[PDB]
Design a protein around this ligand. Structure first.
Ligand SMILES: Nc1ncnc2c1ncn2[C@@H]1O[C@H](COP(=O)(O)OP(=O)(O)OP(=O)(O)O)[C@@H](O)[C@H]1O
Ligand SMILES: [Zn+2]
Ligand SMILES: [Zn+2]
Ligand SMILES: [Zn+2]
Lengths: 79, 1361, 231
């Protein structure tokens, strides 16, 4: 009887907390490049991470719009 | 006269009133901030659209039509708001007044359209009952004023005399010049907008701009002498034939009618009921059993009427009430006292032988239709009591389809009643409401308050359900419509039918076949040109092949709109708002499940359930299906061999269809299922379509229902004791073998299955669901068909994030899915009450698992608490919302690559993108996310509702992982939670991310459970003196980590002799303080460390490290990063005593190479060998190393050193990798060339690298184009490889030829699990990238494989030659 | 697949409008009616095989029967007229298309590029003839170099084109799979001739109507480089 909800809730959060880790990785990569600003592997490892960060932000920035539009369509009917 | 003065209430309608604080509980968002954002948008939109009187929207008949494009999801019915003077606009589902402005958006559950209309602008001329020309939904042009003007015989012969009458011609009709009306012979009567023909005396009203009085005159009263003298008979004929709507009638058919009634003025406060009129309320209160307070005339003025139930007096404007009619009371005060909000009261406070026979029949028919036995049409099977008169405000969605051409158009009832001519038909699915529709029509006619139908003199509602094909009309109507076998005879009826013709309407229900019909009626269908009697026949789509031959168009009933479902529930209930509110949210998010309520019969199914549990504040999404098929047994039952048989056979069809994603069947697919298409029960589950097609097809009622039936059938197979029909259940069950689909595509299926009752199926299903995610073979089975998603947009969205989650953090994905499947298995066991036979599977599953804290709220852990000891850990994260400023772009890369910029030509220029645009676009997208996440509320852990609620005695949580990230200060509730949870565990591990001040507020809890803390990992966290003192009082610490910013020069190192249990030490400080210079000399004694991860610098003869290792025989991981070191050979020698080392990492300028290689053969347990950054400038050392690597048979990760030694002897290293049958990762750095790189491919063919996952080649400065083409064409077999990196530094870009690009695209498709390809500094033109972007769609790992080519360096390349 | 007999070659010579390469290429030799009619006869036969495949919807079920049939056959394609069934043939029946020994392209439309520039497989032989090029662009070279990609062996014929002169060295530079080069009535320069004499893997070289008279380090200056030349 304990609210047996058969649904995958919290996915938006599970995703967002993943992207935030990529952000931390990007900052750390920047620090390593800063200390060795001529190292070709430090550079490659910086843009590979940065591209992924951009790719995923561009994904949730779309999904979040969809989710926002759904919720805003609910509070508008039972105000 | 200034229609309304254009309402403008400061543009602050607001609508809300802080009633949303309870909604955030369901949504997770602050509904208050959200409402504010919406208000702003509405204010802006209003200023961009037109305001003022709109004459075209003057008729409510048209206003209703404008809502045919209104969204199906709402709280208000178009009819309710159309009646309030509103019409639909094209902007964001907003509505607007015809008389007034007042642009209003959305809807509510606690407000009606009229309540808002008079709240945001009470001065509206319409609401105040001023003459604004409002036209009733049901109205006609012919008025029948029955009043003659002055001596027009002479007075109005001249045009001037006629024109002079139009002095007060209302502004609301000034689109038609009075000069035209005058020319046509019309004069103004003084009424709202009617005019009278000066000769004929006929009167027409409801004039609209664009009307032509000569055409209107020709259609009604065509015999008028004036018209005949002025226009040719040909012109008159053309005007009539050129009209639209009425087919064979004129003014004479709307007058002298036996069902006429005068109606007041279409006032605003006339919701949607017949009883809105005083005359109808009063002249119906006839059965009132002489109860005290018999002022019926006064009662009627209270908006009250008799429902037909003993003493229930109902109000047309608010519903059933006044039960037991208090004797001697006053209905105006009782009504007000009980319902002090009713719009009606608010308005009140503010303010010829056959001919005579036909007449007698007419009166009897009217009495039969308005009687309280024809009304209260058993809607929703509520009761014989509990009046449902107020529920007759919902209509059906009707469309008109042509039988020949593929043409379909939407209709509203006012446009149907005006087109009734010869033979018409209404088609629909079983339960669509076609029987109620026919009765409603007969009712409106009898009432007489519905002009447009008042032209009919006789209306007969008959049911051809068992009538024999030889019975005459008199013998039928005397049985079904009249009280006794009298009044009429067969000859009387026939004589009447052939005299009235167009004025006689039959409503024929329950039609089956043309043969099984009374001969007297069949003749009115087959030869309906010698009579012209109007017939309306209602059929199921399972037939409707018999009468199409006699039609032109068909009226088809479409899906019953969601907003009608909401209204019905709102009116019947509302006593339990917490249940209705959940209903609205559920179907808001699950957009495709709105299709469940397709047929009114499903709405009845809900009501029947909601009346049994009126105070249970929960919405069960499958209750409607369980109810629907229960009530099915109360229609026309035959449980044995019929009901069970039809459900079983249909269930088999559904079950097969749901695993091939069919949802559509032909006749052969149906026949093999054993379904009889001519059975009556197999029409309440499924519908047949025989429309203009070469071949027919079958479809189940709204698809969600098919899944329900499939679920039901699967259970029967699993429970049955017949092996022949039982193993089949397992066959179908095993079709679900992908954890990616069990959380999406099959989500609803599984929820229906784990809800229906079962006996043996329970254990059989849970043993599967807990197996699917048990091992790593099925857990990693990422697969989808994408067919089940085509019709379900809400799942397509859900899976958009899951595919992403899997790529960013696979561990999060696996943990999340695993926990979900556990819940479904437990739910199943509890719902079926088979827990005793399911627990063994759960216990097997739980072993070694990690669950979240909230998983302990599951009842299972209370009933069987010993299972807690099987878990490895509980995860308890806290996040708060601390800011992490930014990525900080264009501050480093801007001082790096300048002066080394490449010179790319015009065609390959796209390889390099500008940084300024890259950053701008990213920043915009990031902000759009932040503004949403800020509106979310985490919700503190509800550790009470079963939460390990064993007032814990014998069992404890074996390990608690506390993950603290981006939080500073915890509130009191969190302190209560942390203390409660901490005392419930045996081992506490603290992971502290950037969270300054955190270990100051939870002190009260740590001080009680000091000895339970075993790990403390510190990230970018500043430590205070008080914090360090607390840490030094945690004597049980086994693992201590400091990953940065410890520059406090505090006692954490000086007092590193208190942690006597320490086994794992990890030190990596951004600020270099030469750690170990600060560690006591007594530390390297008795500790026996297992992990040493240290970043050290400027140490000399560091005997402390040597001693620490010497006394650590169980050392597993050794990472050493430092500058100039001493006695390296001694360190390498000492490590030989550590026989269990699995990982070695040496990556700085201290490594001496030779002393390493000499000792390397003594380490045989190594799994990871990382020497990146080291150099081996020696062929002899290199060769020895290369051979040693072949002995290290356990290596998974081999990261090679660089330098000349390896370059010269690289082939040996690659060839020996055929012995290392476990390699997962290989990384090369400037070691391979054109001749040696191909050896990788050769080994893969020979049988090596079979498990390789990551192959990194950044060596590409020493390889030419030929070395890649030859490599790609030689690579056939590496069925584990996920990432292939073949990239170069931007200063040495490679331009690919067509044959190289082609070779690559072929190579990728031979690597079936590849998901990442790196190609930086490769130059491809617009046609080459267009090849790879197509190849991707033929790749097994579609929607994953990503190719990285572009550079984002902060400069423009020189694009010239 | 077992039929080899030509039958009657009399009549139907009007098939394939360029009866004699539009009355241009081919001298007084190889005028034997059979020499040209047999090729036409086969082209029709191969097209018939393709049509039967489409009208069977057998997909991969008959991948062997429809491979044995085509093996050893020829196929002529007009670059200015590419029937859609050729796309289906190359797209849906791989390992068959590669069993053909010719594939001749008569010339640069994007359709020619899209058809050949794919990721499936290389053809045994590809033969390309250029007949109408008064001017050659840079983009034309870029596209042509993609068409040449899908072959294990290239035979290139340049006939009566002047826009190619001075740019031949910019076309052959992308042909590492060329074994036969024929040039007719092209005002080639020394730079082009030096490129030709650099292709040591060339087997067939045929030059017609070259009237430079002065070849200072040109084609006739050495020609001892093409040691693998047979014709
Ligand atoms: N406007 C309405 N509001 C609420 N319920 C409705 C409405 N119209 C129809 N219903 C429901 O429809 C049911 C009747 O459905 P329908 O008119 O399709 O008849 P049926 O079940 O197909 O059988 P038959 O055609 O023999 O009457 C009634 O039980 C009624 O509860
Ligand atoms: Zn208004
Ligand atoms: Zn008239
Ligand atoms: Zn009321």
């Amino acid at each position: 009887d304990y609210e047996w909800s058969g649904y995958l809730t919290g996915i938006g959060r599970a995703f967002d907390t993943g992207v935030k880790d990529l952000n931390q990785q990007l900052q750390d990569a920047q620090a390593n490049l800063t200390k060795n600003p001529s190292d070709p592997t430090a550079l490659a490892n910086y843009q590979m991470i940065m591209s992924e960060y951009n790719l995923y932000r561009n994904a949730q920035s779309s999904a979040v719009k969809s989710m926002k539009d759904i919720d805003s369509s609910i509070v508008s009917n039972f105000r | 006269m200034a229609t309304q003065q254009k309402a403008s209430d400061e543009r602050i309608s607001q609508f809300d009133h802080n009633l949303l604080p309870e909604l955030s509980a369901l949504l997770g968002l602050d509904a208050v901030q959200l409402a504010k954002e919406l208000e702003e948008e509405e204010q802006k939109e209003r200023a961009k659209m037109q305001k003022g009187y709109n004459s075209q929207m003057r008729s409510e008949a048209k206003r209703l039509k404008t809502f045919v494009t209104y969204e199906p999801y709402s709280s208000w019915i178009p009819q309710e708001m159309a009646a309030a003077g509103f019409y639909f606009t094209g902007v964001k589902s907003g509505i607007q007044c015809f008389c007034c402005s007042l642009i209003l958006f959305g809807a509510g559950l606690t407000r009606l359209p009229i309540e808002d209309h008079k709240r945001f602008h009470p001065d509206c001329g319409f609401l105040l009952n001023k003459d604004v020309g409002n036209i009733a939904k049901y109205d006609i042009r012919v008025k029948n004023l029955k009043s003659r003007l002055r001596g027009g015989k002479m007075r109005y012969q001249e045009e001037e005399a006629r024109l002079a009458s139009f002095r007060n011609w209302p502004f609301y009709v000034q689109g038609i010049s009075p000069c035209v009306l005058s020319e046509a012979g019309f004069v103004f009567t003084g009424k709202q907008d009617t005019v009278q023909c000066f000769s004929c005396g006929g009167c027409l009203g409801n004039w609209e701009e664009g009307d032509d009085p000569w055409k209107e005159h020709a259609k009604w009263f065509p015999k008028c002498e004036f018209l005949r003298s002025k226009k040719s008979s040909e012109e008159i004929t053309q005007y009539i034939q050129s009209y639209k709507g009425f087919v064979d009638i004129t003014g004479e058919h709307f007058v002298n009618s036996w069902v006429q009634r005068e109606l007041p003025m279409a006032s605003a406060y006339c919701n949607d009921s017949i009883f809105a009129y005083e005359e109808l309320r009063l002249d119906s209160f006839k059965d009132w059993p002489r109860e005290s307070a018999v002022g019926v005339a006064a009662l009627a003025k209270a908006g009250l009427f008799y429902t037909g139930i003993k003493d229930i007096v109902q109000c047309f404007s608010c519903g059933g009430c006044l039960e037991k009619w208090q004797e001697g009371d006053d209905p105006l005060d009782d009504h007000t006292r009980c319902f002090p909000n009713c719009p009606f009261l608010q308005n009140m406070k503010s303010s010829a032988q056959w001919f005579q026979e036909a007449k007698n029949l007419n009166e009897q028919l009217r009495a039969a239709y308005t009687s309280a036995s024809f009304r209260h049409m058993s809607l929703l099977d509520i009761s014989s009591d509990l009046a449902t008169d107020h529920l007759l405000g919902c209509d059906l969605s009707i469309a008109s389809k042509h039988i020949s051409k593929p043409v379909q158009e939407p209709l509203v009832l006012p446009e149907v009643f005006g087109n009734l001519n010869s033979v018409m038909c209404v088609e629909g699915e079983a339960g669509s409401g076609k029987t109620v529709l026919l009765k409603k029509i007969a009712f409106l006619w009898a009432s007489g308050c519905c002009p447009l139908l008042n032209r009919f003199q006789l209306v007969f509602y008959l049911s051809l359900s068992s009538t024999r094909p030889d019975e005459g009309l008199a013998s039928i109507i005397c049985d079904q419509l009249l009280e006794k076998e009298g009044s009429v005879t067969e000859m009387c009826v026939r004589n009447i039918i052939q005299q009235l013709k167009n004025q006689v309407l039959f409503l024929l229900d329950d039609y089956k076949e043309i043969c099984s019909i009374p001969q007297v009626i069949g003749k009115l269908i087959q030869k309906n040109h010698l009579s012209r009697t109007c017939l309306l026949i209602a059929v199921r789509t399972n037939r409707a092949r018999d009468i199409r031959r006699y039609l032109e168009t068909i009226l088809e009933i479409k899906a019953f709109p969601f907003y009608n479902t909401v209204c019905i529930l709102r009116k019947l209930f509302s006593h339990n708002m917490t249940r209705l509110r959940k209903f609205m949210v559920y179907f808001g998010k699950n957009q495709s499940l709105q299709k469940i309520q397709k047929t009114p019969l499903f709405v009845a199914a809900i009501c029947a359930h909601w009346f049994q549990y009126p105070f249970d504040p929960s919405f069960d999404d499958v209750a409607v299906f369980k109810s629907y098929m229960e009530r099915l047994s109360l229609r026309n039952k035959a449980t044995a061999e019929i009901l069970k048989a039809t459900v079983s056979s249909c269930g088999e069809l559904a079950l097969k269809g749901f695993f091939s994603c069919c949802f559509e069947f032909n006749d052969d697919d149906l026949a093999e299922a054993g379904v009889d298409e001519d059975e009556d029960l197999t029409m309440c589950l499924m519908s047949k379509f025989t429309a203009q097609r070469l071949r027919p097809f079958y479809r189940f009622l709204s698809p969600a229902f098919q899944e329900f039936l499939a679920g039901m059938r699967l259970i029967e197979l699993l429970d049955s004791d017949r092996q022949e029909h039982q193993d089949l259940g397992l066959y179908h069950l095993k079709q679900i073998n992908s954890p990616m689909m069990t959380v999406s595509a099959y989500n609803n299926f599984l929820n229906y299955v784990s809800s229906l009752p079962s006996t043996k199926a329970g254990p059989k299903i849970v043993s599967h669901l807990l197996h699917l995610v048990d091992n790593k073979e099925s857990l990693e089975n990422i697969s989808e068909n994408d067919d089940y998603l085509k019709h379900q947009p809400e799942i397509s969205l859900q899976m958009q994030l899951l595919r992403g989650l899997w790529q960013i953090c696979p561990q999060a994905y696996f943990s999340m899915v695993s926990e979900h499947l556990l819940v479904l298995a437990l739910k199943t066991a509890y719902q079926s009450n088979t827990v005793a036979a399911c627990s063994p599977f759960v216990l097997q599953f739980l072993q070694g698992r990690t669950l979240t804290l909230g998983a302990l709220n599951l009842q299972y852990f209370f009933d069987h608490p010993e299972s807690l000891s099987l878990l490895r850990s509980i995860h308890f994260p806290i996040r708060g919302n601390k800011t992490s400023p930014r990525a900080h772009f264009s501050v480093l890369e801007t001082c790096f690559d300048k002066s080394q910029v490449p010179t790319i030509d015009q065609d390959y220029a796209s390889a390099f993108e500008p940084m300024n645009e890259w950053e701008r676009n990213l920043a915009e997208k990031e902000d759009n996310v932040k503004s949403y996440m800020d509106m979310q509320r985490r919700a503190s852990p509800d550790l009470s509702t079963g939460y390990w609620k064993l007032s814990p005695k014998q069992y404890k949580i074996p390990c608690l992982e506390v993950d603290v990230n981006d939080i500073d200060v915890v509130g009191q509730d969190m302190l209560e939670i942390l203390m409660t949870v901490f005392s419930a565990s045996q081992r506490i591990e603290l992971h502290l991310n950037h969270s300054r001040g955190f270990i100051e507020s939870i002190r009260p809890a740590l001080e009680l459970s000091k000895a339970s803390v075993t790990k403390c990992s510190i990230s970018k966290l500043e430590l205070s003196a008080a914090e360090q003192e607390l840490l030094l009082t945690l004597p049980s610490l086994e693992s201590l980590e400091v990953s940065g910013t410890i520059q406090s020069q505090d006692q954490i190192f000086p007092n590193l002799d208190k942690f006597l249990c320490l086994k794992e030490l990890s030190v990596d400080l951004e600020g270099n303080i030469n750690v170990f210079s600060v560690i006591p000399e007594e530390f390297p004694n008795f500790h026996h460390m297992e992990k040493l991860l240290i970043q050290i610098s400027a140490e000399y003869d560091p005997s402390k490290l040597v001693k620490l290792i010497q006394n650590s025989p169980n050392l597993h991981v050794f990472h050493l990063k430092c500058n100039f070191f001493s006695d390296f050979g001694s360190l390498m020698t000492m490590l030989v005593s550590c026989k269990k080392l699995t990982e070695i990492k040496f990556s700085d300028s201290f490594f001496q190479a030779v002393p390493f290689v000499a000792s390397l053969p003594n380490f045989i347990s190594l799994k990871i060998l990382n020497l990146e950054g080291q150099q081996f400038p020696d062929e002899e050392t290199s060769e020895k190393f290369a051979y040693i690597l072949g002995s290290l048979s356990n290596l998974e990760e081999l990261i090679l050193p660089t330098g000349d030694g390896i370059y010269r002897v690289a082939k040996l290293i690659i060839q020996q990798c055929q012995q290392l049958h476990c390699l997962r990762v290989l990384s090369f750095f400037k070691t391979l060339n054109d001749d040696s790189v191909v050896e990788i491919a050769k080994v893969a063919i020979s049988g090596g690298f079979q498990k390789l996952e990551n192959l990194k080649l950044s060596i590409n400065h020493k390889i030419t184009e030929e070395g890649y083409r030859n490599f790609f064409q030689a690579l056939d077999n590496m069925p584990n490889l996920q990432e292939l990196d073949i990239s170069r530094h931007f200063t040495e870009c490679i331009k690919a030829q067509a044959t190289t690009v082609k070779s690559l695209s072929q190579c990728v498709l031979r690597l079936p699990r590849l998901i990442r390809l790196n190609m930086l500094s490769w130059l491809l033109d617009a046609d080459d990238i267009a090849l790879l972007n197509v190849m991707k769609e033929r790749h097994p790992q579609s929607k994953y494989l990503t190719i990285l080519q572009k550079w984002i360096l902060p400069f423009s390349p020189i694009i010239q030659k | 697949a077992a039929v080899y007999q030509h039958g009657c070659l009399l009549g139907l010579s009007i098939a394939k409008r360029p009866l004699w390469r539009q009355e241009s290429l081919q001298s007084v030799k190889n005028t034997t009616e059979q020499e040209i009619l047999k090729a036409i006869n086969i082209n029709s036969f191969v097209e018939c095989g393709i049509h039967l495949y489409q009208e069977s919807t057998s997909k991969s079920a008959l991948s062997q029967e429809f491979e044995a049939f085509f093996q050893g056959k020829s196929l002529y394609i007009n670059s200015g007229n590419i029937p859609d069934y050729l796309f289906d043939f190359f797209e849906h029946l791989p390992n068959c298309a590669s069993a053909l020994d010719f594939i001749k392209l008569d010339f640069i439309p994007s359709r020619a590029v899209s058809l050949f520039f794919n990721w499936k497989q290389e053809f045994r032989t590809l033969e390309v003839t250029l007949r109408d090029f008064s001017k050659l662009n840079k983009q034309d070279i870029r596209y042509l170099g993609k068409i040449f990609s899908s072959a294990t062996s290239l035979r290139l014929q340049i006939k009566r084109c002047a826009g190619v002169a001075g740019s031949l060295s910019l076309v052959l530079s992308t042909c590492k799979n060329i074994y036969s080069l024929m040039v007719e009535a092209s005002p080639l320069t020394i730079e082009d001739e030096r490129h030709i004499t650099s292709v040591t893997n060339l087997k067939t070289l045929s030059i017609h109507d070259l009237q430079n008279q002065r070849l200072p380090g040109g084609l006739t200056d050495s020609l001892g480089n093409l040691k693998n030349l047979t014709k």
